[PDB]
Design an enzyme around this catalytic site. Structure first.
Site, PDB file in Angstrom:
ATOM      1  N   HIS A  20      -6.400  35.874   9.036  1.00  0.00           N
ATOM      2  CA  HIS A  20      -5.508  35.325   8.014  1.00  0.00           C
ATOM      3  C   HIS A  20      -4.035  35.635   8.306  1.00  0.00           C
ATOM      4  CE1 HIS A  20      -8.930  34.913   4.959  1.00  0.00           C
ATOM      5  NE2 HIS A  20      -9.408  35.865   5.740  1.00  0.00           N
ATOM      6  N   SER A  52      19.675  33.748  31.908  1.00  0.00           N
ATOM      7  CA  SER A  52      21.096  34.059  31.866  1.00  0.00           C
ATOM      8  C   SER A  52      21.297  35.555  31.653  1.00  0.00           C
ATOM      9  CB  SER A  52      21.833  33.238  30.808  1.00  0.00           C
ATOM     10  OG  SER A  52      21.482  33.663  29.514  1.00  0.00           O
ATOM     11  N   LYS A  79      14.614  37.390  27.435  1.00  0.00           N
ATOM     12  CA  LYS A  79      14.251  36.124  26.820  1.00  0.00           C
ATOM     13  C   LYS A  79      12.872  35.680  27.291  1.00  0.00           C
ATOM     14  CE  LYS A  79      15.865  31.418  26.108  1.00  0.00           C
ATOM     15  NZ  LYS A  79      16.348  30.208  26.836  1.00  0.00           N
ATOM     16  N   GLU A 129       4.313  24.942  25.231  1.00  0.00           N
ATOM     17  CA  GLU A 129       4.841  23.751  24.577  1.00  0.00           C
ATOM     18  C   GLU A 129       4.338  22.478  25.245  1.00  0.00           C
ATOM     19  OE1 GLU A 129       9.083  24.490  24.278  1.00  0.00           O
ATOM     20  OE2 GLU A 129       8.703  26.195  22.960  1.00  0.00           O
TER      21      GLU A 129
END
Lengths: 463, 464, 463, 464
Positions: free
Chosen positions: B189, B319, B325, B332
């Site tokens: 959940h 970068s 990052k 995706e």
């Protein structure tokens, strides 16, 4: 034969085709996303990026964050893209990041490198126009791609889909008027029913398309709202004050379409509900178009052992094995397009649910499905109009045969001879394979002249 | 600058571009169906037509209705098509007649004209191989297009989709084994639950792909059945005795795949239920792949605002001002492909309902959607494997941090103090922002020593 | 125990439960359509039939084709149905004829028999009110069912769905205002991003619901058009002149909703494009609601090893085996309802394509799916509002911890110390597990006081 | 009028209607999820919970963690539920928590309280059988609800859907055999084509149903796997050694169906791919059934405005002034059911993608849609068989009229005069509204005697 130049980043050297205007980042992205055929991102998205990059440069110069000489360099390449001269500079697929980051970088690199050549330099040298610092100034991948998606979607609907549907509707309306006095037999449940005119039947198709047009136009105000200026998360951090409104004004000017800045940039980044809304209206049109095309091919079916009430244009041989057969192939193309739109609606709706927090990362698949539906509906409506609808004609003898042989007109007799006598005529005609008129006369219940006066199909198509 | 020659079919004369190998019927279709991008009929369908036209010629010669010299002429052009040399001769769209007749005629015309040029003749003269009487001998569009669709569909699934899914499954299995001793916190959940190993969690993904592979393979026998030999309406009118079996044998030989003749040619023409059946299994795989890709990006979420239990590879330079990052690029791409497959299933299912009488005339849209799903699943699984799955690694300190502070480790005290007492401890810590151990001592329910002895996450990942 | 009366038609005798007000035709229809649970035709459809039958009787009496005493008998039973007193008299399923013929006959029989009892007779005797000749006067099954469908659909949307969505939107708007100064860390791709306020994030949800409300309201004018008066095929044969307009006026009066007669009765019978149109807007709302509910449960996840930025009401134990666990169960109910609506849209769109000639015979399945979506969205929005949204509160310490530990605020330093020094701070913080402030100070690059002045999260949430 | 007793759970006190056998957690759910019609959780799910709770008690006693006297108390109430005596004690909706926890607690509470009354106690007193410690022993909601879903789904398919489809298939097969000598006109693209027998056309429908049955049966092994024993996150924490295998054996015994324990409990909790897999096969059947029902009403269309090649039964009295009226009632019910199944597949596929980490919390909506499709297909197939298919009869005079009129009988002249000459004849008759034979004589292409000898529809329904 393939000659390369060598570019460099922190992943090392990368070979880029020597004559191509994209750069290291686009080249790496080709390999990172080898998914489906190359270059599948729609050209309409690339064109829309050219509009918004030009507008961003103009807004940035007005607001004194970009020198006008660099604006002019950027704008010149954008004009070349809009003229259709540079599509071979966009090799990336739909199935990239869900923010469309790689396509944003692809246009930034192409603008940067082509500007350098336009300035008199050699492709591969350092450009006067930096892809990120200049071409991407005041922007994020996050707000640029949805802006391109809306520009492309709105332009396709207003410049292609709506005109094509309108033209087909006009043809069907002219046919409906031409057919207004041709009485035919209705069919309900696929079964014999009471009469209506062929013009009335066609007027239904007209009304369906009119409603679908209204419904699609109702969705345009939400689709007109643009995310540009929301930057990474919607706050507009890293834009000059007033950039949101000014850049939308430039987009509206350059496209000639009534774009506005989105009232809520969080809604504009985290979801694509305008695409869901507008696609639902495209799907509504596809639902109506399917039914229209289906009826027309059923009405034209035969030519001997089907319905046969109308003739349609016969455009090509239908079969090599069955000689002289001709099929309603425009109707088939239309119904297949409609089937495609219904599944595109499933994909768009699914993707539309899946935004998380500040960003929906299903943008390319939503854009691709939307543009495909809008384009295929437009093209199919043009083709179906020109190669089918304009040439529909009634088969008046067949229509009249069906009316004269129907048992369904018998109730015109009730007020004159009573229910029981009317039923006796219908039962006798059904048993004998004869017409109502034949049995009314031969049972001695109605004279031929009285029957013709009391049973007038043209008096049976209104209140 | 466009120069044309004049050709004709049974309907009239047609101007055909002088250097193109198609004929009158292809040219009519090219001009009459300006719907979507040019030449959109999938090349896999064209290749499949080349296999079946070669097989039909071989079967017709064996059954003594076509001379072997004409078989050889036809077969030579089919080989050229299969080698990829003639795609410029196929200009027709998906959105044509719903039987695909026009693409059948396209290959008949191209074979006929290219054979004539191969024989030393001039393009535009009467060919030694007639497009209908020779290239289409014993055939209809109604049985050829379904045959091409099955050949293309089966080949894409067995030669591309299945190998790609299998490889990804193998990588996830190796990761599951590598991670079998790393204890992490379950989430149900979205809320903190009890422990399981990272290997156990990954083993679920492996099992999902194994079931999807089995389900897809279960659909192959129906997809192996070919309509060829049913001709116009399913009866086999105008075929030599034994042609159905023989032509399927040649198709199986030339493709190397186990095609057979359809047991019922009416079912094979009037519906495309095998495409519905097989696509349902592609969609089942897409449903599982979506969940797998979604979990992996959630587990990688970070570097600091999320879960951060795993590391995923970086595929772009990044970068210097953005250290740490995370770019879930493949997650995706995969989830978008899966969204596409779901809608392709709607389209295929709709079209599959819509056959009328002896023929389903939604064949191209069904073939296009099927091949797209099979191709995109294959390509996305390759890309996801190579650019994400092979490089997944645990963040063991973060995993330990998140398991050690789950309040649902209090489940371990159920056997000692009862589910009701354990609830009061967890509820108190949640209210006070404190730890389980401190509240259990505050409540007088557990001592410190008892808490350290009884609460061990590594003892909670199996049965009693 | 079961006692029957014996009715009779040309199929012979048929036993009807002795106390029930339906008749022989409804009884036979129970057996002809034993498909799913009994009595599944929605009560809202039966209620809508009562409105339209009352209106038809009033219009027929005004136009002098039905005596007013029979109008009064019919209207009285319609009022009883509208009061909810007779639902036990409707045993038929959704999965009947696609024109809903059997439900039309069911109300005709119930009105006929209950009127006879109201007149002082015994149930089972011949009624003063004939089911077909009086209760069905000027009507067809073909035009009555789609009228009932529109009445029920419009009433559900305007009296239930819209108010429920509006209330939830208002709560989320009040929360957005309350949260307008709470700065939090954005998430894009699920990954750390730049800041926005919790109020800004919630304002996105508000805007999504506002757009969905506008889109749904845009669909109401088409849904307000009624087929009644088209009769069997759309021509209005067997209606008195002016009946179409007058009967719609009575329906508008009795329901209090702005119904009008359909401008094209062929479109109104041969297709249900208004149901497709309106359902697409319900589905648009479901797409937005899914995302809203998903974000809220993610933001509330934990309480220790998830996100934990908000608290939500804890309404029940979540688990027996895991003591004290509480789950976002209202969010789960909402997301399940949204999944249902998306599939209902597939069914409605499919059925909407399948009309043939004068009649779409998929009416009950379209009505059932539409009413289910409208009802479930309404009920879920009420429940989610009352049991989740009203009680959302920020976890301010957790939100602040996430902001203070983020590496994403480092770019606030660029204009003050330069890109390279800013990057050095971020790289050192990332390597060491420390904060930006800790490394800015301890690298000797920024003082604590200067850092606090230059890096203000509340200054990073706008242009 | 409403009187309550006071109960409690770990969260606080709850007023429970004094005569109801549920407890505090059921009452909370009843009041907190007023979504859709009351008590909508399918009774098949409640019955499936009764089987699995009985099995769990039997397994727990065998494995020495539950006394046999408590097993007997639990089992007795499970039998009462299975007999249909306690449905008023299950007031919860589909649209509850997405794990179905609340329905699990509903059966635990009802078993506990009804057992106490069966033992001679007063409803509301402490029970000899504790709802969590005894009735839920060795279990979680996370493994019980998926188990109930599979039991209910498998039973509906094997005991209802498959038998109904099989019976309809048998009727269509008998009709195909009865019609094997009746020559009718084929229709392709809705246009007149070449002949086939009415039996051949019906044989296509038979083959479609046979393939759908095979495809559905292929999905049964995955559906037979049960989550029970995975407990909270899949690890089997808090189960006795061997419980997973033993409880599945008891479920298989009590249901008489071949259930097994799931090979991977993480796959069994985090996703419901077996429901996606099996539902795709139900949808495949619905796609075929739509086409079959559509054809049958088109073939019956009439009495005079359409095709009229078959008669279908009338199931209503009709009216004396409407002789010959055709009422395709079952075709409409069936096609509407099929439309429903298509959308249920969208919902199930969407929900199937949406599991997160260790648990999919879309379980009730998946179960509800699956059971609805399986039930409606079964019921519609029974109704369509009994009220339509068994009574289909040919209209032989109309069939003969329509085959004799087809211009595509000209295909029979291809072998004598060539496809191009045959095309001219059919094209001329079409233009002139005349017959094939008349134009073939006018064109000088065939004599009257040659036309009669060469054109025989009964010779066109097989190979050369």
């Amino acid at each position: 034969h393939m000659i390369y130049r060598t570019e460099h980043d922190t992943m090392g050297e990368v070979k880029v085709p020597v004559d191509k205007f994209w750069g290291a980042q686009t080249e790496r992205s080709r390999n990172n996303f080898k998914i489906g055929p190359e270059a599948s991102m729609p050209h309409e998205i690339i064109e829309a990026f050219a509009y918004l990059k030009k507008a961003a440069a103009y807004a940035n110069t007005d607001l004194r964050v970009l020198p006008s000489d660099k604006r002019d360099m950027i704008s010149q390449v954008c004009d070349e893209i809009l003229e259709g001269k540079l599509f071979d500079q966009f090799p990336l697929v739909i199935w990239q990041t869900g923010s469309g980051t790689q396509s944003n970088m692809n246009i930034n690199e192409v603008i940067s490198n082509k500007a350098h050549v336009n300035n008199g330099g050699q492709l591969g040298e350092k450009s006067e126009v930096h892809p990120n610092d200049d071409v991407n100034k005041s922007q994020s991948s996050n707000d640029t791609y949805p802006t391109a998606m809306h520009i492309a979607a709105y332009k396709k609907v207003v410049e292609h889909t709506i005109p094509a549907v309108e033209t087909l509707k006009n043809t069907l309306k002219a046919k409906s008027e031409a057919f207004k006095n041709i009485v035919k037999i209705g069919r309900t449940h696929l079964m014999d029913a009471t009469p209506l005119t062929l013009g009335q039947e066609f007027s239904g198709y007209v009304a369906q398309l009119e409603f679908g047009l209204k419904a699609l136009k109702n969705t345009l105000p939400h689709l007109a709202e643009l995310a540009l200026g929301g930057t990474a998360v919607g706050t507009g951090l890293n834009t000059p004050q007033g950039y949101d409104v000014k850049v939308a004004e430039y987009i509206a000017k350059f496209t000639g379409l009534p774009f506005i800045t989105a009232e809520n940039k969080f809604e504009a980044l985290a979801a694509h509900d305008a695409i869901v809304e507008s696609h639902g209206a495209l799907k509504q049109l596809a639902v109506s178009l399917f039914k229209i095309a289906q009826d027309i091919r059923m009405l034209a079916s035969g030519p001997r052992s089907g319905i046969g009430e109308i003739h349609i244009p016969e455009n090509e041989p239908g079969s090599s094995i069955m000689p002289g057969k001709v099929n309603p192939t425009q109707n088939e193309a239309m119904t297949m397009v409609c089937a495609q739109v219904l599944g595109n609606d499933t994909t768009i709706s699914f993707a539309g649910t899946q935004g998380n927090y500040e960003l929906n990362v299903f943008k390319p698949v939503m854009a691709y499905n939307f543009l495909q539906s809008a384009q295929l509906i437009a093209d199919a409506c043009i083709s179906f109009n020109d190669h089918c609808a304009v040439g529909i004609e009634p088969n008046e003898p067949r229509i009249k045969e069906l009316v004269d042989k129907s048992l369904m007109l018998v109730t015109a007799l009730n007020t004159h001879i009573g229910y029981e006598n009317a039923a006796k005529i219908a039962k006798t005609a059904h048993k004998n394979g004869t017409t109502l008129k034949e049995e009314a006369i031969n049972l001695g219940l109605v004279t031929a002249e009285q029957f013709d006066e009391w049973v007038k199909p043209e008096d049976m198509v209104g209140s």
